[PDB]
């Protein structure tokens, strides 16, 4: 209930640049699973949290890179794998599937006593920029999901316990972080104020 003021002298302009307007590396997914479906698969869609969804939808087209950092909390020497799978190749469905043994996709291997892993993914959209809002139809026949671009796909990561079935049981918690770099945006758009109702489209 106290109303005060302060005179403010400023000269900074480069604080509001778009490159460090989006370099904050917020969290994008938090899910735990067990092992005694014994893994974790997650599409790399971006509109999962409303703190990041509204902040991203100010623009029309943009172009950046991933900088994915997986943080793991959960024991004798747990080794984990995060096999990236892009489009064109198939996704694993069981823990000992032969898609794990495939070399044609990228993979990491890391412990728990180590600091958590870090990779980055370049711009893999087949257009020149990501399409945030898609004003058309993916397909020719009438029932097409209005607002899904086939160029909007990125891939999906899969997290798996490497070790043998041990006589102890445990539960692994996985968090993902994503830091955009080298930002170039176009055509600014007004924000959405009415609350979201789904993740597939804009309804209210």
């Amino acid at each position: 209930a106290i109303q005060t003021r302060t005179v403010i002298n400023q000269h900074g302009v480069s604080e509001t640049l778009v490159e460090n307007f989006l370099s904050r590396a917020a969290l994008v997914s938090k899910r735990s699973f067990e092992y005694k479906k014994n893994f974790f698969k997650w599409t790399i869609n971006t509109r999962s949290f409303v703190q990041l969804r509204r902040k991203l939808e100010l623009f029309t087209y943009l172009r950046f890179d991933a900088e994915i950092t997986i943080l793991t909390t959960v024991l004798p020497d747990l080794t984990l794998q995060a096999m990236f799978v892009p489009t064109g190749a198939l996704t694993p469905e069981k823990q000992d599937s032969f898609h794990w043994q495939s070399g044609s996709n990228a993979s990491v291997f890391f412990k728990i006593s180590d600091p958590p892993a870090r990779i980055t993914i370049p711009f893999m959209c087949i257009n020149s920029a990501y399409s945030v809002f898609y004003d058309g139809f993916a397909g020719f026949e009438k029932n097409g999901l209005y607002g899904i671009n086939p160029a909007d796909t990125i891939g999906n990561l899969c997290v798996r316990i490497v070790n043998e079935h041990q006589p102890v049981g445990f539960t692994v918690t996985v968090r993902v972080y994503m830091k955009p770099k080298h930002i170039k945006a176009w055509a600014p758009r007004p924000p959405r104020t009415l609350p979201y109702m789904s993740i597939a489209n804009a309804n209210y």
């Binding site: 990501y130 004003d135 209005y146 758009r189 104020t193 009415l194 209210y204």
Partner: protein, 231 residues
């Protein structure tokens, strides 16, 4: 505007306000895709395809169109949508109404790129018939929120002019090619979304003043894929 076949005469010149800064530019220095010898007809498209006259009553709530959609049916550009699948074109929009000096009201011509629509109070995506209207165009059900949850109070970020019935009765907006890919498909993608929104409704001594509003569209510098080849 003596352009090609037609000429919309007796208009206030106003301003050829470019959208951001640019021109259709004929797309040079691209040889890594679409090597099919683009035909690029120019003098066979510039006609000023006019639309159906609409009626703006007191309780009216606006209209909207899609630019690659509404021209699929009419003219030489309507034929060239079929038996072709890649194109690139810039547009020209001429919006003009008419009234007496005794009416009063305000309109707002605005053009949005990649304007994804939505439905009210459901969880089902809109159907194919809820988008592909064609020439006649559709109607806003909730104009205050633009049927996507975005506020109309911030909608002047797009290129726009103010048709004010005390001052003027015309507007002209030039749109360049706004797309991620250089060339695109007509039957499943619409870049721009032309829409008009009444802000202040009309008023007179009688009722049912029509104020007919006419929109004319003309492609500036179109091109297509290849159709004729040696071997």
């Amino acid at each position: 505007l003596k352009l090609g076949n037609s000429a919309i005469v007796t208009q206030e010149a106003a301003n050829y306000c470019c959208a951001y800064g640019e021109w259709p530019n004929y797309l040079p220095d691209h040889e890594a895709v679409a090597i099919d010898k683009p035909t690029q007809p120019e003098t066979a498209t510039d006609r000023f395809y006019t639309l159906k006259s609409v009626k703006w009553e007191t309780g009216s709530t606006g209209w909207w169109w899609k630019l690659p959609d509404a021209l699929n049916n009419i003219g030489m550009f309507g034929q060239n949508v079929q038996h072709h699948y890649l194109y690139r074109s810039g547009f020209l929009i001429h919006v003009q109404c008419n009234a007496t000096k005794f009416h009063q009201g305000a309109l707002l011509v605005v053009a949005i790129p990649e304007h994804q629509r939505g439905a009210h109070n459901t969880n089902t995506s809109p159907g194919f018939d809820d988008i592909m209207k064609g020439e006649e165009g559709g109607t806003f059900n909730h104009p205050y929120v633009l049927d996507d949850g975005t506020s109309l109070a911030c909608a002047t970020i797009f290129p726009h002019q103010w048709i004010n019935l005390r001052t003027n009765n015309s507007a002209t907006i030039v749109l360049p090619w706004m797309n991620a890919a250089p060339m695109d498909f007509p039957l499943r993608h619409n870049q721009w979304t032309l829409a008009i929104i009444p802000v202040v409704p009309l008023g007179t001594r009688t009722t049912s003043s029509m104020v007919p509003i006419t929109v004319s569209i003309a492609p500036m510098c179109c091109e297509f894929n290849g159709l004729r080849h040696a071997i």
